[PDB]
Amino acid sequence: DGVGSSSGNWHCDSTWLGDRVITTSTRTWALPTYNNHLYKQISNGTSGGATNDNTYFGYSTPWGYFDFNRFHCHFSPRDWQRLINNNWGFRPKRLSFKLFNIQVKEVTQNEGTKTIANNLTSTIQVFTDSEYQLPYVLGSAHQGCLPPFPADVFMIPQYGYLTLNNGSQAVGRSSFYCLEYFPSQMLRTGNNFQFTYTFEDVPFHSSYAHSQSLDRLMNPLIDQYLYYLSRTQTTGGTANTQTLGFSQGGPNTMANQAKNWLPGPCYRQQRVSTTTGQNNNSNFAWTAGTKYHLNGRNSLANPGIAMATHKDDEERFFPSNGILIFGKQNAARDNADYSDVMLTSEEEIKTTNPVATEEYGIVADNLQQQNTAPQIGTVNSQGALPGMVWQNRDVYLQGPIWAKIPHTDGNFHPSPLMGGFGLKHPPPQILIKNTPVPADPPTTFNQSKLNSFITQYSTGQVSVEIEWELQKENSKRWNPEIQYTSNYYKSTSVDFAVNTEGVYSEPRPIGTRYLTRNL
Amino acid sequence: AHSQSLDRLMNPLIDQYLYYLSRTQTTGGTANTQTLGFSQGGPNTMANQAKNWLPGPCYRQQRVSTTTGQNNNSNFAWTAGTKYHLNGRNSLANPGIAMATHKDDEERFFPSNGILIFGKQNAARDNADYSDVMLTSEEEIKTTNPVATEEYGIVADNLQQQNTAPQIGTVNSQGALPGMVWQNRDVYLQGPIWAKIPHTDGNFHPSP
Amino acid sequence: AHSQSLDRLMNPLIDQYLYYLSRTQTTGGTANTQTLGFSQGGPNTMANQAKNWLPGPCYRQQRVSTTTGQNNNSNFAWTAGTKYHLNGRNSLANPGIAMATHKD
Amino acid sequence: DGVGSSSGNWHCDSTWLGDRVITTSTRTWALPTYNNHLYKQISNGTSGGATNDNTYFGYSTPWGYFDFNRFHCHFSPRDWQRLINNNWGFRPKRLSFKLFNIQVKEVTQNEGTKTIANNLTSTIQVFTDSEYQLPYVLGSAHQGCLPPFPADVFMIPQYGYLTLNNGSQAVGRSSFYCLEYFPSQMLRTGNNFQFTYTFEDVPFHSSY
Amino acid sequence: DGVGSSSGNWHCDSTWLGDRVITTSTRTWALPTYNNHLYKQISNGTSGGATNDNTYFGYSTPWGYFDFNRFHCHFSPRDWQRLINNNWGFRPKRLSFKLFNIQVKEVTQNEGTKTIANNLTSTIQVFTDSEYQLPYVLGSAHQGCLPPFPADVFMIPQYGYLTLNNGSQAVGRSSFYCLEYFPSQMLRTGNNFQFTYTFEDVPFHSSY
């Protein structure tokens, strides 16, 4: 474990083995000293501009954390292509994490001339929250994951957390955590860190689309033996009176046929169009937004339960807060243009799932009588009903992978809404920090905590290995399937590649669901 | 068939130790003002008693009668039909989730698309008579399951205040709620036996 | 008791990479027309942030106060009661599914 | 024992086991050079303001000392809560002490521009007064213990002692101690120090 | 594998053995950081001066490469003389490659005064494209091979490649490669790299 010997090698590869694929990626990182070595209380209240919906109480910390919860941390674009085009499903089995080649540096600033040198005897600290005792902040779709492009160098994100609040104030149950109250490894240059984790059994993600729909599973050529009420009134001439008539469902009355199953749950959302002209002229984004209400605070149900983005022939429409949206490269943080963002679509599930912007269905409102005409009600939110079947949201190359399932007495179908695999025991948080190095202390004792420190940062490499288990296709379909393909014709630059300026970009979102399977 | 019903699992002879709000206003004379009064559930107030369970799910259907005279004079079979909407297409939810066909003493009523119907021999394919078909009934489940043609229940609509009287809402479709218990639809000698459960990520209680 | 709430499991210091529709109409002056604007969820817009989970089930009940003066003057205990209907009989859903008694 | 390898890891935890609790804490420290490398005689007399009640004779030394004689050096607030709420008594049984990850630095001052660099070949010296031959200065409630908050960084206190005095003057029995007349470990970066101690039987404190 | 110990020795020799000759050469090299750490798309089109015959689409990379594909990398002039004057044919059988004595340096520029120092904890990365997955750029007669004269010191060439183009534009089949998507060895000063390769059967060159 020398100053002069490397502690790691660079592993970035993929290997495919029948029913497994293993991915490895290595990236270079930089870690600053965060927060001036301090833990600070932060809050947001209702004074000034701030709304109640946005209040919080929390702490910010001197630590940083490692995040690889984005598919493109692990899969190259071509690899993602091999996966989606060929497999019905996949899931994660196990991972390996390595930190190595660690360099701690001190920066000296005199007279506007700045210099950087190694501090050989310096350490950094790392630990994993193996027991899940710290608030789990992965899974909230934050920035700071390993870059898609291997050549890119990245900065480690600062760690902070939230607890209960009333306005800008803490409450009795509010909790404070010190990360220094955990055991951590200390590494000098020449030391390394590693750990291994095994994923819990989780269902394969469905990289497939149904080639059948719930409302059409019958034999087109045959009648049912079952009957339905087809006529309530006589049909001939003007003297029409009530009657009862019954008919057998058949090829031309598939809508009426008796069926075994129901479409999935519905929490309806407002429809907006990409053709702006077709939209109402108000700013209705949050006012007409679909929301949930918790303890007096309102949150967008974004993106909410999975529903199809649009019905047949209406690519223009999307749910206002019902899809995942990714930025194009260098898209602005605020108020980016439609041309600067990429909207996902979940067409593939119209097959079993309600369209996002429409009713679930219709129910009776009242009791009909000779003097009372029957009335119906439109159902815009439907909870789980026996016989319902549904599909989860898709995952994307630039999307999230896993989430920690919250620790609660109950849940229904705990698949993370943003997409991915939901785990009771997800990959643990990995926290890293530069150890403080004091500048020279005073020569006579003072009890106050030291506030003068040498200025330091560290850089190193990090490796992640994941084994994924694959589910192969078993289709008897005669004709060819849809596949993700690169564009045939000439172009100014190559998709999923660099610029003349050296900027990698991902042009489109890529989903998982090209192959088909029956219902 | 159950010989007990969800709303009557108590001991008829004993009071609960639990209390419920029984009075919101004073009772004597004309100068009546708000108050709070609390009482213990008992033999004569079984409706008020605290209970552990809830009836099963409800997707309400229109009621029709075998006595034609009692029915509205329109052809309302599909217009007033209970339906689901999938990708722009509408289908009868026939017969839908299991609910009891009728309540006590009302054999005449059935849900318009909520029961299985079999033909008598040589009944016509189209527009057969009532006398030519046989309607099933699922009386046996009124015990735990909502009647097909009625509301699940009532919920509050608003927030009452000194100046605002309280308002209630009628619930005609109810999804699964914790504490719900229910019974499946019956099977018949001339009925189906099995179905393939569709291959999907999720399902709730995949009984055909 | 939980020391965290469902609506606040994020990192207070970091933005989401996900975007949401933040603007439906232009903001400047009087000639305001429709547009589409998108923003990233963040520390000051926690209400808007994309989230994984939903709160538990709800069967709503009427609110009454211990300060009698603040209550409507009717006897509304069973008339405004939350109920279930079984075979033509009505029962209080007492106490019903678990919901919090009151807010902050 | 390299320049480039850490000699310790950060342990800060509590574990509760029935009738034992074990606490671990780690803190970062800084030690200045005290006294310019000198031992100095100090006294306080009766001249000027000074009263007789406050007289002393003593020495100050180039050394520093480690103090963890404050409960919150070891117990987090929540831990203290588990202890007091649940137990009739407690007492200390044994301890482990470690010094590690040592960096010695030299500071260079020219022209108002100051720079700090490592001095790799430098040493520090540590020893324990296992035989109780030096005046025991813990136990007098001084400042300079490890901080309650683990994230805080602290400065080591200077060591000094007192002996017999008459006014500002020494007497026959007054004693002078040199700490360099004890054996001590010398550590460069990459070296570490540790020791183990067992508490004598002592009565449980009454948390009741 | 120390900071202070050499990891290699200088071997430059020839030995002749009847039907074999073995050559060894060692050279000193320097590697700059290329491209500012970036991969950049490059093209040449038909605008301006440029003819169609000279169009290309490609990328340039942060990497450098080692080239010894020139006979005088291995044979001294006198050695070449012994070979040509005396033999009807020759061919290559196997090779050994070593990288050693690696020094990584950082350069600091302030106020027009520049200084160079070692960065001890720094690494370089090396790999061989053993599976031929990158575009093979040797064999195109480029500059940057090891010098003929052993005393000369040389600069490592930058690596870049080309793919399909239409004019200055990419086409569907155009490919992008990232070299960081390969496993590589990381070496600090005091680490070394080596590999061995065997030539496939190939016909003797005719020196006649």
Structural class determined from secondary elements of chain A: mainly beta
Per CATH, the architecture of chain A is Beta Complex
Q: How far apart, in Å, are the first and last alpha carbons of chain A?
A: 58 Å
CATH class of chain A: Mainly Beta
- Strand content of the residues of chain A, in percent? 25-35%
Shape of chain A: elongated
PDB class: virus
Keywords: beta barrel, Viral Capsid, virus
Entry title: Structural studies of AAV8 capsid transitions associated with endosomal trafficking
Chains A, B, C, D, E: Capsid protein
Structural summary, described in words:
The structure is cut from a larger assembly and holds 5 copies of chain A. By secondary structure, chain A is an all-beta fold. Chain A has a single domain (1-519), classed as Empty Capsid Viral Protein 2. Helix content of chain A is 2%, strand content 32%. Chain A has 1 helix and 31 strands. In chain A, strands 1, 2, 5, 6, 8, 11, 12 and 30 form an 8-stranded mixed sheet that branches. In chain A, strands 3, 4, 7, 9, 10 and 29 form a 6-stranded antiparallel sheet that branches. In chain A, strands 13-31 form a two-stranded parallel sheet. In chain A, strand 5 and strand 6 form a beta hairpin. Chain A starts with 12 loop residues before the first strand and ends with a strand. Chains A and B meet through strand 14, strand 15, strand 23, strand 24 and strand 26 of A and strand 5, strand 6, strand 8, strand 12 and strand 13 of B. Strand 10 of chain B pairs antiparallel with strand 3 (83-86) of chain C, so a sheet runs across the interface. Chain C: It comes from Adeno-associated virus 8. Chain C: Belongs to the parvoviridae capsid protein family.
